[PDB]
Enzyme design. Structure first.
Site, PDB file in Angstrom:
ATOM      1  N   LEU A   1     -12.408  35.737 -40.864  1.00  0.00           N
ATOM      2  CA  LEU A   1     -12.051  34.529 -41.133  1.00  0.00           C
ATOM      3  C   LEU A   1     -11.171  33.657 -40.140  1.00  0.00           C
ATOM      4  O   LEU A   1     -10.325  34.215 -39.678  1.00  0.00           O
ATOM      5  CB  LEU A   1     -11.393  34.599 -42.470  1.00  0.00           C
ATOM      6  CG  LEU A   1     -12.067  35.227 -43.845  1.00  0.00           C
ATOM      7  CD1 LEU A   1     -11.365  35.161 -44.910  1.00  0.00           C
ATOM      8  CD2 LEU A   1     -13.661  34.761 -43.630  1.00  0.00           C
ATOM      9  N   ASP A   2     -11.474  32.406 -40.225  1.00  0.00           N
ATOM     10  CA  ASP A   2     -10.534  31.471 -39.380  1.00  0.00           C
ATOM     11  C   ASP A   2      -9.137  31.497 -39.915  1.00  0.00           C
ATOM     12  O   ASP A   2      -8.865  31.566 -41.010  1.00  0.00           O
ATOM     13  CB  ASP A   2     -11.203  30.398 -38.943  1.00  0.00           C
ATOM     14  CG  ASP A   2     -10.808  29.553 -37.962  1.00  0.00           C
ATOM     15  OD1 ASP A   2      -9.746  30.201 -37.293  1.00  0.00           O
ATOM     16  OD2 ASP A   2     -11.332  28.404 -37.540  1.00  0.00           O
TER      17      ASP A   2
END
Ligand SMILES: CCCCCCCCCCCCCCCCCC(=O)OC[C@H](COP(=O)([O-])OCC(O)COP(=O)([O-])OC[C@@H](COC(=O)CCCCCCCCCCCCCCCCC)OC(=O)CCCCCCCCCCCCCCCCC)OC(=O)CCCCCCCCCCCCCCCCC
Ligand SMILES: CCCCC/C=C/C/C=C/C/C=C\C/C=C\CCCC(=O)O[C@H](COC(=O)CCCCCCCCCCCCCCCCC)COP(=O)(O)O[C@@H]1[C@H](O)[C@H](O)[C@@H](O)[C@H](O)[C@H]1O
Ligand SMILES: CCCCCCCCCCCCCCCCCC(=O)OC[C@H](COP(=O)(O)OCCN)OC(=O)CCCCCCCCCCCCCCCCC
Ligand SMILES: CCCCCCCCCCCCCCCCCC(=O)OC[C@H](COP(=O)(O)OCCN)OC(=O)CCCCCCCCCCCCCCCCC
Ligand SMILES: CCCCCCCCCCCCCCCCCC(=O)OC[C@H](COP(=O)(O)OCCN)OC(=O)CCCCCCCCCCCCCCCCC
Ligand SMILES: CCCCCCCCCCCCCCCCCC(=O)OC[C@H](COP(=O)(O)OCCN)OC(=O)CCCCCCCCCCCCCCCCC
Ligand SMILES: NC(=O)C1=CN([C@@H]2O[C@H](COP(=O)(O)OP(=O)(O)OC[C@H]3O[C@@H](n4cnc5c(N)ncnc54)[C@H](OP(=O)(O)O)[C@@H]3O)[C@@H](O)[C@H]2O)C=CC1
Ligand SMILES: CCCCCCCCCCCC(=O)OC[C@H](COP(=O)(O)OCC[N+](C)(C)C)OC(=O)CCCCCCCCCCC
Ligand SMILES: CCCCCCCCCCCC(=O)OC[C@H](COP(=O)(O)OCC[N+](C)(C)C)OC(=O)CCCCCCCCCCC
Ligand code: SF4
Lengths: 334, 231, 56, 177, 340, 123, 71, 117, 77
Positions: free
Chosen positions: G33-34
């Site tokens: 996930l960013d």
């Protein structure tokens, strides 16, 4: 920069041999070169069609009856785009003046009840005949004639009967006219639909609210009409504009109740009693539910097997469940 | 927890363009956030595309009750840059009409103020005097409000032949016209209830905030450009 | 911090030109429309702006 | 079904050339005359004053012209008003507010556009934040030219609006339906 | 039955038209105090102005905002108008000459008056516009506070009469009007009748400059007609209360000598002439009071809420309790307790 | 004095990129949190997930900007926008400027290759 | 209760392994996930439960196990 | 059926008739933008104790004033006796009014600048 | 064409009825000004509104706006 989204190309040739050259990017100050007469422009569908037409600066000639009802149409176009003409169906010269200079003629003139001056025949068959005679005499390039879904000659309903007769006389007079049949149209401030369900004291059905039709958004009908206006391949075709999925009147009322957080009152009455009631209320001067409307309350939508649809215009109708909240927002109360 | 109200734009006290977002704890104003730009026209951007002569009318329409003082500020700037001198008669005309303009502006401000508090009659009495002076404007310039009369170098046209007598005739009775407004306002205890110790501003905060004019002279500081920088 | 009156003038300078004023407590547009893009008094901003409005 | 022919005339006069030749026509003319007389006699605007034009709009109500003597009361709420007078430069920041106040006036409603700025954008026509005329936003019935229009010009525009009211068919139009 | 009907129609028509023409009279009088003319164009000399406004408003669409209780918004003006007009049933234009000759006439007046705060209290809840709510709460406060002053002056006057029949109170004043011994009480009744009616200078309730319009911000068409009509009818009615409590009602002068000169026996001519004299006296008193309402509107700036509340509860009410103490004391000192 | 308004942050140019990314992520979180408030205020037809999608696109557009001063300016403008939205200063008209895609189809002909662009003089 | 966390986190794009949500799975390490994605999932959680979470500790959450120890 | 009751009945009928005339004759075209509440042209709760207190103290004072109605209707019959009784009643109430005044019940930066040298 | 102003700049203020009104004009030697900023007294007054009006009642805010004597052509130009 803006863009002439309705036009395929820049130079256009009408069927009548007029060369039309669009000027400008496509915004308010631009001009497509087309001229269109929109009969019944101040109505529910005519307003949207006129807004879309004058958005790109095609000259719109609006024949009107009451001065105060048409005022909102002037806002939709630049100076000199929207032109107003006084008109009456019993004044032939007036119709001639309205259609004389146009490349496109669309008529939306239709009434859902009868009046002391215009019965269903007078408004749907003789009115269409006069308009189509003016069109044929002036050799107008494109004539679009809007009728109603379920338009059949031998219908039980005088509305559908006169609509079918109007279609026949239009085809007889102008062989190249385009016939459109839209389904029940909804949208903002619609007629005898959502807004009625949202603020009625009680909805009274003579057939258990069982009738099925595919309701279609009015914006979509207007966009399809515009597309039919500007492509010459729809000449002498019949179009059945209808929504994606089939609904029952009771289903729509249930959806309206769920979206309204308020229960809509439904009362079921015998058909004879409701006829007598509607025939009685036809005595007041403001529009009210017709006897023939309740006759039509026993007809479900019938779609022609062989008829061009939204797909042939590369369009996709929106969904009635999706718009509900947007279309009835001022009555939620909450 | 503050309660937020949008005072204006459609409000007579707001003058139509003052969206004054207030936050109230009951009756009392805790913070005030005036929002402006409902009348941002881009006058300053447009002036750069105009000759000086062409840009002059932009100033009539800035403070649209003090037209000739606006024309006068712009004219003084341009003459100071131009290093030229207005003739004597021109200077005197600009002073007379600067004070006629001051009288008109104060009639509008005082009478609009009293109308805001509720005193509706001085509005009309003072508006008749305004009409009388706008006759003089129209006679020298041709327009009642936006004269475009005071121009870099002087004034556009000389006075018409019968103007000084008419101004003097009006001046003989303006004194009484003032006394009547003062009769209604100066000693009325309701007026003093609405105005005494309201909107108090200290001298030092007046200087700090950039206030000028009556807003500064009310706090005790005798500063007046007409006396300090005699123009 | 020195002159109270400079609050609004610095909001105007930012709005017209884009100049930032470090330490300004509440620096936002004062004149232009809400959501206006561009700083109009820049010599490269065109006279008439890039956008206009109408009723749809 | 049954009705299969029509008998509608072919030279029925248009409303603008129609004269009242019958008992019911005279009755409807009288009712329309009453209603239009009321509409002209109680002329209530919403004041919506924006700039230098609002000053000539106040001078209309000053003693010398006394709009009140004709039946004009400026009313702050749009709910109690017939007429909107757009008196001033309309900016892009103010356009939604103007359209909102126009929408909240009950019918029947008229709009008068006063001054060059409201007519056509006026002296700021080429500004980046000015609407080039209020008829981009609201339908307009009478355009009063001037910058600013004198009080007499604004009163003349009012007389034009009343003349338009006086020729309006209300029940006669319904009879034509 | 027929006579009852004719009397009611005559009285009702006179009251409704008097209210209608009070609006025109206000505009014209303010106009001449402001060196202008006021309505002189709709009808000859502007005499049809009020009916022009009426017809227009009856042709105006009714707007029911989205968050509003539409039933309450439409019925609140209706009840305030009804009570304002019901208040007229007890007002006499001559001895016993009234629609309702009640022995509890004063109590009826006070009760129907106390039914007058409900329009203000209800409209703010019905409109839901925030300006209306602020106006409604402040108005309800002001109106009840000044209703106290009005009720207290009523009581002080009944101290002199010992009767709740309005005609009797008027008849006792042939000796002297009660505004002579109680001039300060008359000043306070005016200052309080102005406030109870919500007129300038005490127009805080619907003041356009502090709050756009007022509680009526949302009222278009006939509901606006009702608030308007109720307001001017209440102006006239409270001027009537003032008239018969303090100005001697329909008493002008002793015309016994004159009638004995003119007539020699009772006749419909003489009864009519007497009726006209009494009614003219009472109507001229009403006219002076209405003119005074308009005059005060022309002359003074508004109060603030704090100012008027302070007035009523710190300057007026102490004086009225002091008078409560000093009037029966003077009756006791001089042995003049009034009989029933 | 003239005090700051609701959700006002004094202008400060971060001297280091990391201290700026802390503020940037805080601002993004504020926008995501406020999405439902925006949906109530501005009576939008579309859904809260679409608001949040739009916010993510807006923050994405400057994901590769390097020079610190430009990042500082972008962050300051983003905060000014957030304060504008959350305080209901903006109206629906200006708010929907952010949302050009959710309007309906504008027309049949949006050219994509050279021949359709050329036919409309937009080549 | 932690299953509600797993349900909220599962219905998010950019992950092709729904079952990879182990009770101590780090977003930037496992889920990929960013940073913006991390803020998104954090706000989704705090919204599902209706609790407001201050700035600091909200930043210091990096894994499912941290979500449940703070839940 | 005297004039009183007929007039009382007649007034609401006139109100309802005016309302019905308005409903019958006026157009009726609601739409969302018109139905919005008016606040100066654009879409968009703690109070003070004295608001509560004016209303609440209205009721006792109203009761005090209306308690004198029996007195003024029976002044002569009660003679110099009732007179004294009603003085005592009034003074007792005046005490509460004094309390209200002195507590200021209905009513709703001056430091020097010192430098540490 | 118009007359050409010698290059330079000036701030010139007068005692306008509303207070000090001034203009800061920048000349580039040409016939059109390079820059013109108008100092409107109403701008500074309305800026000081929030300091002046804190702690007052709403009618006092109305009276304060009255005494500032704002026109709002000055405020936004
Ligand atoms: C005199 C009395 C007043 C006249 C009313 C006129 C009228 O009907 O206009 C309605 C009118 C209709 O509105 P609309 O624009 O047509 O929209 C209607 C909906 O769209 C949806 O419209 P709809 O299609 O659902 O129709 C609703 C229908 C309702 O229809 C039904 O539901 C009847 C169903 C039963 C049918 C069978 C019955 C038995 C048959 C027996 C045979 C005979 O109501 C009518 O249309 C009545 C038509 C007949 C009018 C008769 C007038 C004659 C006098 C001249 O409503 C309004 O104009 C609103 C005005 C604002 C009202 C605010 C104040 C109201 C609250 C006051 C409370 C009173 C308390 C008193 C204490
Ligand atoms: C004193 C008054 C004197 C003036 C008398 C009449 C002039 C005013 C008449 C007038 O504007 O209504 C016009 C009709 O116009 C006629 O043609 C309808 C016929 C007019 C009826 C005349 C009756 C005269 C005496 C009335 C008492 C506008 O209603 P409209 O078409 O929207 O029709 C109706 C009507 O307004 C509402 O009752 C309905 O609820 C609503 O649905 C609406 O659609
Ligand atoms: C004061 C004068 C008051 C009287 C006004 C005079 C009106 C003259 C009307 C001429 C009669 C013509 C007629 O046939 O009217 C019938 C009309 C319905 O006609 P239509 O237009 O078809 O509406 C149908 C909608 N369902 O239905 C109506 O017109 C109803 C009108 C009733 C008005 C009664 C007033 C008493
Ligand atoms: C009823 C609701 C509230 C009534 C208020 C009482 C008003 C009143 O005082 O009525 C008195 C009056 C008769 O009283 P009086 O003065 O003695 O008449 C002598 C005249 N020579 O009374 C009258 O003159 C007429 C009576 C009016 C009220 C009648 C209403 C009947 C109530 C029953 C409603 C049924 C449901
Ligand atoms: C605000 C408006 C104030 C206006 C007040 C008007 C005052 C003048 C009328 C007084 C009326 C009154 O109560 O007594 C008048 C009465 C008339 O006497 P008569 O007609 O002969 O009847 C015989 C039976 N007594 O008996 C008298 O004539 C007595 C003398 C009149 C009362 C004193 C007059 C001097 C004071 C006037 C000041 C009024 C307020 C200022
Ligand atoms: C004295 C005069 C009496 C006249 C009263 C007659 C009322 C007729 C108006 C009407 O038909 O209904 C109006 C009422 C409006 O409310 P609604 O439309 O439901 O919601 C609006 C929210 N913006 O719609 C309603 O909700 C109806 C509520 C009242 C119930 C009466 C039913 C009337 C049916 C007509 C036959
Ligand atoms: N709405 C629906 O659900 C459906 C509608 N249709 C058709 O759509 C078209 C329009 O829909 P809609 O716009 O809702 O209808 P509207 O009633 O909203 O507008 C219809 C138009 O017809 C005009 N008109 C009617 N009779 C006459 C006449 N005798 N002389 C002159 N003009 C007349 C009206 O003008 P004025 O305003 O002057 O009366 C109005 O402009 C009609 O043809 C209708 O039959 C078909 C199927 C479904
Ligand atoms: C009804 C309700 C009560 C209204 C009272 C006043 C009515 C005046 C009026 O109706 O006015 C007279 C009318 C309109 O006059 P006009 O010259 O057409 O227009 C006037 C234009 N102005 C204002 C510029 C001068 O005369 C008519 O044609 C109708 C005559 C019959 C009127 C019946 C009235 C019944 C009462
Ligand atoms: C008490 C009543 C006093 C008023 C009566 C005189 C007004 C008048 O009759 O005036 C003439 C009216 C129309 O007035 P106008 O159109 O404005 O012309 C006025 C001329 N100018 C220059 C002033 C514009 O003619 C009519 O139709 C009269 C019918 C109305 C009957 C209803 C009366 C209700 C009571
Ligand atoms: S038209 Fe002229 S006078 Fe009127 S507001 Fe605009 S600039 Fe001012």
């Amino acid at each position: 920069m803006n863009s002439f989204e309705n036009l395929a190309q820049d130079v256009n040739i009408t069927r009548s041999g007029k060369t039309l050259i669009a000027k400008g990017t496509g915004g308010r100050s631009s001009r497509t070169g087309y001229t269109a007469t929109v009969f019944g422009a101040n109505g529910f569908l005519g307003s949207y069609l006129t807004a879309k037409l004058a958005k790109h600066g095609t000259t719109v000639v609006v024949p009107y009856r009451e001065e105060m009802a048409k005022r909102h149409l002037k806002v939709t176009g630049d100076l000199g785009v929207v032109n107003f003409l006084e008109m009456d169906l019993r004044n032939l010269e007036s119709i001639d003046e309205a259609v004389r200079h146009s490349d496109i003629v669309v008529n939306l003139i239709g009434r859902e009840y009868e009046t002391k001056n215009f019965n269903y025949y007078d408004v749907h068959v003789e009115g269409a005949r006069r308009i189509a005679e003016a069109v044929k005499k002036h050799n107008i390039a494109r004539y679009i004639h809007v009728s109603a879904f379920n338009a059949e000659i031998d219908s039980p309903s005088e509305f559908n009967h006169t609509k079918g007769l109007g279609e026949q006389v239009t085809k007889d007079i102008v062989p190249w006219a385009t016939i459109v049949r839209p389904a029940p149209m909804f949208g903002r401030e619609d007629k005898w639909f959502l807004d009625r369900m949202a603020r009625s004291p009680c909805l009274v059905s003579a057939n258990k609210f069982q009738e099925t039709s595919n309701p279609v958004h009015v914006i979509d009908v207007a966009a399809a009409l515009e597309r039919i206006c500007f492509d010459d391949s729809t000449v002498a075709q019949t179009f059945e504009l209808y929504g994606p999925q089939k609904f029952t009147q009771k289903q729509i009322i249930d959806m309206v109740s769920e979206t309204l957080r308020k229960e809509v009152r439904h009362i079921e009455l015998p058909k004879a009693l409701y006829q007598a009631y509607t025939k009685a209320t036809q005595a007041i001067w403001w529009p009210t539910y017709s006897p023939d409307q309740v006759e039509r309350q026993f007809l479900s939508q019938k779609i022609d097997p062989s008829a061009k649809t939204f797909n042939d215009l590369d369009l996709t109708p929106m969904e009635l469940p999706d718009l509900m909240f947007k279309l009835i927002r001022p009555y939620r109360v909450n | 927890r503050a309660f937020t109200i949008n005072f204006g734009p459609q409000h007579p006290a707001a003058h139509g363009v003052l969206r004054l977002i207030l936050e109230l704890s009951g009756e009392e104003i805790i913070r005030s956030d005036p929002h402006v730009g409902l009348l941002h026209r881009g006058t300053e951007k447009l002036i750069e595309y105009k000759t000086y002569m062409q840009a002059l009318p932009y100033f009539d329409r800035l403070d649209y009750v003090s037209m000739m003082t606006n024309e006068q500020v712009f004219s003084l700037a341009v003459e100071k840059l131009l290093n030229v001198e207005v003739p004597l008669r021109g200077k005197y005309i600009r002073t007379m009409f600067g004070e006629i303009t001051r009288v008109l502006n104060h009639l509008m401000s005082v009478c609009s103020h009293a109308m805001d508090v509720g005193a509706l009659t001085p509005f009309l009495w003072g508006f008749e005097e305004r009409e009388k002076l706008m006759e003089f404007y129209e006679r020298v310039s041709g327009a009642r409000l936006h004269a475009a009369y005071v121009r870099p170098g002087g004034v556009s046209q000389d006075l018409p032949a019968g103007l000084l007598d008419d101004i003097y005739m009006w001046a003989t009775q303006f004194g009484d016209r003032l006394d009547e407004i003062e009769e209604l306002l100066t000693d009325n205890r309701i007026w003093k209830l609405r105005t005494v110790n309201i909107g108090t501003v200290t001298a030092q905060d007046a200087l700090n905030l950039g206030l000028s004019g009556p807003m500064l002279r009310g706090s005790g500081i005798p500063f007046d450009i007409r006396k300090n920088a005699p123009y | 911090c020195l002159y109270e009156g400079a609050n609004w003038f610095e909001r105007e300078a930012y709005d017209m030109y884009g100049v930032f004023f470090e330490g300004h407590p509440d620096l936002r547009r004062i004149m232009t429309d809400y959501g206006f893009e561009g700083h109009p008094l820049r010599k490269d901003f065109p006279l008439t702006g890039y956008t206009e409005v109408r009723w749809d | 079904p049954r009705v299969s022919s029509s008998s509608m005339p072919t030279d029925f006069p248009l409303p603008s050339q129609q004269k009242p030749n019958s008992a019911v026509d005279y009755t409807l003319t009288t009712l329309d005359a009453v209603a239009n007389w009321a509409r002209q006699g109680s002329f209530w605007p919403v004041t919506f004053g924006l700039a230098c034009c609002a000053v000539e709009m106040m001078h209309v109500s000053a003693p010398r012209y006394d709009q009140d003597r004709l039946g004009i009361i400026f009313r702050a709420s749009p709910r109690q008003s017939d007429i909107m007078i757009v008196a001033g430069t309309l900016t892009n920041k103010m356009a939604p507010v103007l359209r909102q106040v126009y929408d909240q006036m009950p019918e029947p409603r008229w709009v008068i556009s006063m001054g060059s700025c409201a007519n056509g954008g006026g002296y700021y026509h080429f500004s980046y934040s000015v609407v080039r005329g209020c008829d981009r936003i609201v339908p307009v019935d009478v355009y009063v030219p001037g910058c600013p229009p004198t009080s007499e010009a604004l009163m003349y525009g009012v007389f034009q609006l009343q003349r338009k009211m006086r020729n309006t068919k209300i029940t006669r139009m319904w009879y034509r339906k | 039955m027929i006579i009852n009907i004719v009397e009611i129609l005559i009285f009702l028509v006179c009251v409704l038209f008097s209210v209608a023409y009070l609006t025109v009279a206000e505009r014209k009088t303010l106009a001449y105090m402001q060196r202008r003319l006021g309505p002189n164009f709709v009808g000859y000399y502007g005499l049809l102005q009020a009916f022009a406004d009426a017809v227009k408003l009856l042709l105006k669409e009714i707007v029911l905002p989205k968050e509003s209780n539409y039933i309450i918004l439409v019925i609140s003006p209706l009840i305030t108008l009804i009570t304002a007009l019901i208040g007229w049933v007890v007002i006499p234009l001559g001895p016993g000459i009234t629609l309702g000759e009640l022995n509890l006439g004063i109590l009826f007046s006070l009760a129907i008056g106390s039914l007058g705060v409900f329009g203000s209290l209800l409209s703010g809840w019905s409109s839901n516009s925030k300006y209306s709510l602020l106006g409604s709460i402040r108005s309800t406060a002001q109106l009840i506070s000044y209703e106290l002053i009005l009720t207290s002056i009523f009581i002080i006057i009944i101290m002199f009469v010992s009767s709740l029949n309005i005609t009797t109170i008027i008849e006792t004043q042939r000796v002297v009007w009660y505004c002579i011994p109680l001039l300060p009480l008359l000043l306070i009744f005016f200052i309080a009748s102005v406030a109870e009616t919500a007129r300038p200078p005490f127009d805080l309730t619907e003041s356009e400059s502090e709050l756009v319009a007022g509680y009526f911000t949302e009222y278009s068409g006939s509901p606006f007609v009702f608030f308007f009509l109720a307001e001017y009818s209440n102006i006239i009615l409270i001027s009537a209360f003032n008239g018969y409590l303090l100005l001697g009602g329909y008493l002008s002068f002793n015309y016994s000598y004159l009638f004995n000169i003119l007539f020699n026996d009772y006749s419909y001519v003489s009864f009519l002439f007497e009726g006209l004299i009494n009614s003219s006296a009472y109507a001229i008193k009403l006219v002076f009071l209405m003119f005074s309402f308009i005059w005060v509107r022309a002359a003074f700036p508004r109060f603030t809420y704090d100012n008027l509340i302070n007035f009523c509860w710190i300057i007026l009410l102490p004086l009225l309790f002091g008078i409560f103490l000093i009037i029966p004391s003077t009756l006791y000192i001089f042995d003049s307790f009034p009989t029933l | 004095a003239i005090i700051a308004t609701a959700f006002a942050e004094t202008v400060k140019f971060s001297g280091s990129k990391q201290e700026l990314q802390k503020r940037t992520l805080a601002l993004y979180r504020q926008f995501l949190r406020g999405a439902p408030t925006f949906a109530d205020l501005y009576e939008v037809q579309f859904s809260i997930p679409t608001i949040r999608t739009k916010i993510r696109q807006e923050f994405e557009r400057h994901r590769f900007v390097d020079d610190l001063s430009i990042q500082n300016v972008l962050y300051a403008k983003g905060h000014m926008e957030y304060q504008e939205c959350i305080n209901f200063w903006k109206q629906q008209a200006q708010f929907l400027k952010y949302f050009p895609e959710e309007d309906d189809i504008q027309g049949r002909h949006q050219p994509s290759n050279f021949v359709d662009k050329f036919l409309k003089n937009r080549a | 209760a932690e299953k509600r966390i797993a349900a909220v986190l599962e219905s998010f794009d950019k992950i092709s392994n729904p079952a990879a949500i182990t009770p101590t799975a780090s977003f930037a390490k496992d889920l990929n996930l960013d940073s913006l994605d991390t803020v998104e999932v954090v706000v989704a959680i705090e919204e599902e439960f209706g609790i407001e979470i201050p700035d600091k500790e909200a930043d210091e959450i990096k894994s499912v196990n941290q979500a449940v120890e703070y839940i | 059926m005297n004039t009183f009751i007929i007039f009382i009945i007649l007034i609401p009928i006139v109100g309802f008739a005016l309302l019905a005339v308005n409903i019958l004759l006026a157009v009726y075209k609601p739409y969302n933008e018109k139905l919005g509440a008016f606040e100066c042209g654009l879409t968009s709760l703690a109070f003070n104790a004295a608001f509560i207190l004016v209303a609440i103290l209205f009721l006792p004072f109203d009761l005090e004033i209306s308690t004198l109605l029996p007195y003024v209707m029976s002044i002569y019959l009660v003679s110099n006796y009732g007179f004294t009784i009603v003085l005592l009643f009034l003074l007792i109430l005046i005490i509460g009014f004094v309390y209200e005044i002195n507590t200021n019940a209905l009513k709703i930066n001056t430091d020097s600048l010192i430098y540490k040298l | 064409k118009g007359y050409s102003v010698p290059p330079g700049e000036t701030y010139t203020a007068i005692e306008a009825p509303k207070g000090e009104m001034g203009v800061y004009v920048v000349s580039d030697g040409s016939e059109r000004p390079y820059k013109c900023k108008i100092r409107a007294p109403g701008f500074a007054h309305l800026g000081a509104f929030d300091h002046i009006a804190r702690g007052h009642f709403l009618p006092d805010a109305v009276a304060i706006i009255g005494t500032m004597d704002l026109v709002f052509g000055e405020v936004d130009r």
